[PDB]
């Protein structure tokens, strides 16, 4: 009875379908169906055995021994080996490959040194001891390492093919092979992606869908129309997006799903571009936002105002609902503005250098940017000009620091607060892009990773978070929800609360 094709929207072309380069929710939406790591995420939101059938940990918690599952194969039928993992991780750490997620592998001994030119890749402590054994040594006991091994930077890639064709990842075809529940059988760039069930997947009997058809419709009204005609089985997040004005009606008819997730919506400042190089200007722009108005009137998705970096759903950080400063604090915003102008020798806001606010082309981002533009004009007398870019282009714009203020969202990679902080540890961190670094911040993050006590560790990270908010390299705006509607016959979808979605075991009733 239940159909076996799932029709969904992913809005736009992914940034990369190389797991070692992907850094974004669009790419990740695809790669989380097509690749599998040493571990995978089960329905309870916890890591479990995936490509590794056994995971051993040394007594000190630093050395991991993965036994590769008997008979695991790539989609072309070749065995998945430990050398595929070694190759992939070293590939992501090789500075020549310019992964923005190389820092995700710094947990491994020798990784940072290799990535920053202070060491050989040969001395990164990931080793295929044999075809079925991967040995990994960490700098510190990392209790969430098996969450990291399910993260897409830690996916294997087919070493044989990647050596043959260094552009293997750029198109569907015989040189694009993967090891997950689904495999990618078509990719029309900027059009659509077709995934089909992967008959070489080890746990294929648990996979019920035969086809996932992913379209790329960046018009939220159209996505909802297609859903309402039954041409899509889902409308909304994580991979699609509902029109903000539909949310009242859908909430009222009882069809809307709304779930808080570990994510934050912020405007990044290029702290090396005037006038955003002045902390008082950054603070004026941040304190002058009315986040309650944005979430009530603009987004309408039950998001909560963010005056902090770490989402309050992170155990130990629930007081971030209140945050580090007052929402809509125009009085204090104006005080910061005056202080900044004085430091420049200026008297009025209109004499500041021109400011551009950038975002990725999107119905909702444009509305938020317009609302913020008005708040800046009205509360500070600051005029900004707006510009928008395609998502995959936009990521590179921010990474190259070709911006002044840039909208971004960050979703948790793993269930620990440091994931919201360590992207800003190093100036040249692949996902930083603010030009900011602070020596005490970095010291505190590094100390956090040697502390096993959860209280003392949470306090080190809260101190770090306070330093970050005091230097305001980004303007927090809101903490995310996922909002969607779906065919209620679609069961078995895994949505862990970090904002990802897995269709591995999904089915129509």
């Amino acid at each position: 009875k239940g159909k076996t094709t799932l029709n969904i929207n992913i809005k736009t072309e992914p940034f990369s379908l190389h797991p070692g380069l992907a850094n974004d929710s669009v790419s990740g939406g695809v790669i989380r169906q097509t690749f599998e790591g040493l571990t995978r995420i089960n329905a309870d939101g916890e890591p479990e055995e995936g490509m590794a059938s056994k995971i051993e940990t040394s007594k000190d918690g630093k050395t991991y021994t993965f036994t590769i599952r008997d008979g695991v194969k790539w989609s072309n039928g070749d065995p998945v080996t430990a050398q595929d993992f070694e190759y992939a991780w070293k590939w992501a750490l090789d500075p020549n490959n310019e992964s923005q997620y190389a820092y995700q592998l710094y947990y491994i001994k020798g990784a940072e040194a290799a990535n920053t030119g202070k060491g050989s890749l040969d001395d990164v402590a990931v080793k295929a001891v044999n075809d079925k054994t991967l040995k990994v040594e960490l700098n510190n006991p990392t209790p969430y390492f098996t969450e990291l091994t399910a993260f897409y930077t830690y996916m294997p890639i087919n070493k044989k093919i990647a050596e043959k064709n260094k552009k293997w990842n750029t198109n569907a075809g015989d040189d694009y092979v993967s090891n997950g529940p689904f495999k990618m059988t078509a990719w029309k760039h900027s059009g659509s992606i077709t995934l089909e069930k992967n008959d070489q997947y080890w746990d294929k009997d648990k996979v019920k869908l035969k086809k996932i058809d992913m379209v790329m419709i960046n018009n939220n009204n159209t996505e909802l129309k297609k859903f309402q005609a039954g041409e899509l089985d889902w409308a909304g997040m994580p991979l699609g997006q509902l029109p903000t004005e539909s949310l009242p009606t859908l909430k009222k008819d009882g069809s809307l799903h709304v779930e808080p997730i570990a994510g934050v919506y912020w405007y990044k400042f290029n702290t090396e571009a005037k006038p955003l190089d002045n902390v008082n200007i950054r603070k004026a722009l941040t304190y002058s936002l009315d986040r309650q108005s944005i979430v009530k009137n603009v987004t309408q998705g039950e998001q909560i105002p963010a005056m902090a970096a770490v989402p309050p759903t992170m155990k130990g950080f629930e007081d971030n609902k209140e945050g580090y400063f007052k929402d809509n604090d125009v009085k204090t915003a104006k005080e910061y503005l005056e202080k900044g102008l004085k430091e420049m020798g200026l008297s009025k806001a209109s004499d500041l250098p021109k400011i551009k606010l950038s975002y990725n082309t999107d119905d909702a981002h444009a509305k938020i940017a317009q609302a913020v533009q008005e708040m800046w004009k009205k509360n500070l007398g600051v005029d900004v000009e707006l510009d928008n870019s395609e998502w995959n282009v936009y990521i590179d714009k921010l990474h190259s620091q070709d911006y002044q203020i840039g909208r971004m969202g960050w979703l948790g990679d793993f269930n620990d607060p440091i994931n919201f902080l360590e992207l800003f540890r190093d100036k040249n961190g692949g996902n930083n892009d603010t030009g900011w670094e602070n020596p005490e911040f970095k010291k505190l993050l590094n100390q956090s990773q040697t502390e096993t006590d959860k209280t003392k560790r949470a306090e080190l990270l809260k101190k770090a978070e306070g330093i970050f908010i005091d230097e305001m390299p980004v303007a927090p705006i809101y903490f995310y929800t996922d909002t969607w509607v779906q065919d209620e016959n679609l069961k078995g979808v895994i949505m862990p609360g970090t904002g990802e979605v897995y269709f591995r075991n999904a089915y129509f009733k």
């Binding site: 969202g409 960050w410 979703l411």
Partner: peptide, 4 residues
């Protein structure tokens, strides 16, 4: 990860 960066959210679209």
């Amino acid at each position: 990860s960066n959210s679209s």
